[PDB]
Amino acid sequence: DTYAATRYPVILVHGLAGTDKFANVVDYWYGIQSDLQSHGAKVYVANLSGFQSDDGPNGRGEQLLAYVKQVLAATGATKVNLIGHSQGGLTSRYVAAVAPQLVASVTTIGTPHRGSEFADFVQDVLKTDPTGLSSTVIAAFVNVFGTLVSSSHNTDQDALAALRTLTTAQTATYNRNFPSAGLGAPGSCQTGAATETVGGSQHLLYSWGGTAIQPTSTVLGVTGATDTSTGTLDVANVTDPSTLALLATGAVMINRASGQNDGLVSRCSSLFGQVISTSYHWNHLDEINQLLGVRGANAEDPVAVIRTHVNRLKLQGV
């Protein structure tokens, strides 16, 4: 029907990616491209595997720019609507920066705009252990990464490179080089503006995230955390391995003062443009309806949220 029939094509920009160029990427936004298409959206999913950072000369941002130009040629459209998850939001920021006239909006879904405390933690472990692996938490993350992408003769080094880009230092510098009206003050834990007229082009800036992992009590110097997406004996804890894994990574973050997170990105780091909500009982993969659609008892429907938003865009005139 036309519910999600925006004026400009929607491009879904994945974040967690492997190193193999010749990879497969349709099922990252699990069940989302089809749903959007059923509602009239013209949806394209970018594959940016084999590129690490966004701002190189031969990086993800330039790749995505390429893809945006291809989609436009294929559709006879003049602008696109970028929706990005995790690093995907950061590289959507790059294209809008670099080519204002081709972008109608930039939406962020759990993007570590001010980095990740878990990514920070990992860089410290690697000072001592180059493999990471003596930390069970890191090892948990590596297996989750692997399940979401695949072993393609490896999971290990890709998993780690994925977090490299996302450290507080790294994003600090990125933002310095790639200013957006959508970002608030460093350290304020507030957003910027909902729009931005860059190069005669106004941009609709949106974001949302999930704060399923909540801190609880400090005893003996350590502060607990709770997953608030699950119910007691939740099957999602067995059926989906990322559920507890991201509670573990999320607990590390909490003990590095992140303070409410999806287990990878904290609430404050997530904020960009018009924040639709950060109240979702989601951990980092529930956001993309992931690990094959399993969510805890209290997690909202990822697919409805994104669809409602693509309709929002239709109503805003993009």
Instruction: Sketch the per residue contact string, 193 through 232, with Ca ion: x for CB under 5 A, - otherwise.
Output: ----------------------------------------
Closest CB to Ca ion among 20 and 300?
300
User: Which of the stretches 210-218, 236-244, 269-277, 303-311 binds Ca ion when contact is defined by CB under 5 A?
Assistant: 236-244
Which residue among 53, 86, 180, 242 is the active-site one?
Answer: 86
Is 39 an active-site residue? no
Helix (H, G, I), strand (E, B) or coil at 202: strand
Write down the least CB distance from residue 246 to Ca ion, Å: 8
Closest CB to Ca ion among 116 and 229?
229
Q: How far is CA 272 from CA 54, 84, 124, 135, 179, in A?
A: 18, 12, 28, 32, 12
Q: How far is CA 119 from CA 13, 84, 124, 164, 233, in A?
A: 20, 19, 9, 7, 30
Confirm or reject binding of residue 234 to Ca ion (CB under 5 A). Answer: no
Is 284 an active-site residue? yes
26 labeled binding residue: no
**At residue 217, what is the residue type?**
S
Confirm or reject binding of residue 262 to Ca ion (CB under 5 A). Answer: no
Looking at beta carbons, which residue is closest to Ca ion? 240
122 labeled binding residue: no
310 labeled binding residue: no
Q: Establish how many alpha carbons lie within 13 A of residue 233's alpha carbon, considering only the half-sphere containing its beta carbon.
A: 0
DSSP 84: E
Confirm or reject binding of residue 294 to Ca ion (CB under 5 A). Answer: yes
**At residue 56, what is the residue type?**
G
Residues 6+ apart with CB under 8 A from 101: 78, 79, 199, 200, 201
The torsion angle over the Cα atoms of residues 121, 122, 126 and 127, rounded to 10 degrees, is -20
Minimal CA–CA distance to 302: which of 249, 198, 229, 197? 229
Confirm or reject binding of residue 245 to Ca ion (CB under 5 A). Answer: no
Is 266 an active-site residue? no
124 labeled binding residue: no
Using the rule CB under 5 A, which residue among 286, 302, 306, 311 binds Ca ion? Answer: 286
Confirm or reject binding of residue 119 to Ca ion (CB under 5 A). Answer: no
Closest CB to Ca ion among 86 and 180?
86
For the segment 147-176, give every residue that binds Ca ion (CB under 5 A): none
**At residue 288, what is the residue type?**
I
Which residue among 54, 158, 234, 262 is the active-site one?
Answer: 262
- Over the range 113-136, which residues count as b (16 or more CB within 10 Å of their CB) and which as e? bbbbbbbbbbbebbeeeeebeebe
Write down the least CB distance from residue 216 to Ca ion, Å: 21
220 labeled binding residue: no
Closest CB to Ca ion among 42 and 284?
284
160 labeled binding residue: no
Surface-to-core class of residue 314, CB atoms within 10 Å of its CB (0-12 exposed, 13-18 middle, 19+ buried) = buried
Helix (H, G, I), strand (E, B) or coil at 275: strand
Confirm or reject binding of residue 55 to Ca ion (CB under 5 A). Answer: no
| Residues of the binding site for Ca(2+) | 240, 286, 290, 294
Residues with catalytic annotation?
A: 86, 262, 284
Q: Which residues are annotated as a binding site for substrate?
A: 16, 87
Binding-site ranges for Ca ion (CB under 5 A)? 240, 286, 291, 294
Binding-site positions read 16, 87, 240, 286, 290, 294
